[PDB]
Design a protein around this ligand. Structure first.
Ligand code: FE
Length: 186
């Protein structure tokens, strides 16, 4: 039974219930993430920015079932076009706006990756992707507003692939944490 999360801590408790088993009800998880009304005081601890690129800040390890993290995007910061390593990805905006651009999986032949679509993800909205749907790029295209997003990955993964938009060629990347549980992790 899905109730509105009152706070980030309440959200985390609810997520632990929703991931108690071995499968994932995507629509329920997305609904509860959307229902949490971002409260900046609750996540300030995790909102650690870097001047040069976006940062990943681990919030909860989900009793091994998921990684919950906060990503902090300076003005003009964005990601590679990437996959999600056979895992679910939920992405909820906590502050600002992000542009999500969707791409299909490349063919074997070297070719420009042409965007399938794009959308602007706004405060409190929760998007979802998995490898069956496709690839995406996420960017804070703002010149004036930093963005903050809350990401849930299940199962957790620490590697993925970045894709060269010019060719479709992929490279394995290991994702690094900027902080864990509020502690900077150089
Ligand atoms: Fe992603």
């Amino acid at each position: 039974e899905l109730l509105k999360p009152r706070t980030l801590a309440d959200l985390i408790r609810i997520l632990h219930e929703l991931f108690a088993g071995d499968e994932v009800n995507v629509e329920e998880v997305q609904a509860v993430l959307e229902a949490y009304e971002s409260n900046p005081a609750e996540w300030a601890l995790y909102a650690k920015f870097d001047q040069y690129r976006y940062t990943r800040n681990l919030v909860d390890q989900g009793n091994g079932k998921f990684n919950l993290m906060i990503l902090c995007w300076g003005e003009g910061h964005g990601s590679s076009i990437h996959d999600h390593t056979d895992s679910h990805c939920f992405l909820k905006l906590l502050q600002g706006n992000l542009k999500e651009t969707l791409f299909d999986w490349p063919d074997k032949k070297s070719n420009e990756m042409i965007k399938k679509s794009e959308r602007t993800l706004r405060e409190n909205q929760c998007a979802y992707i998995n490898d069956s749907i496709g690839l995406h790029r996420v960017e804070n295209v703002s010149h004036t507003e930093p963005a903050v997003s809350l990401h849930l990955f299940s199962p957790p993964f620490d590697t993925c692939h970045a894709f060269d938009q010019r060719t479709g060629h992929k490279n394995k990347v290991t994702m690094t944490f900027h902080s864990k549980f509020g502690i900077r992790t150089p």
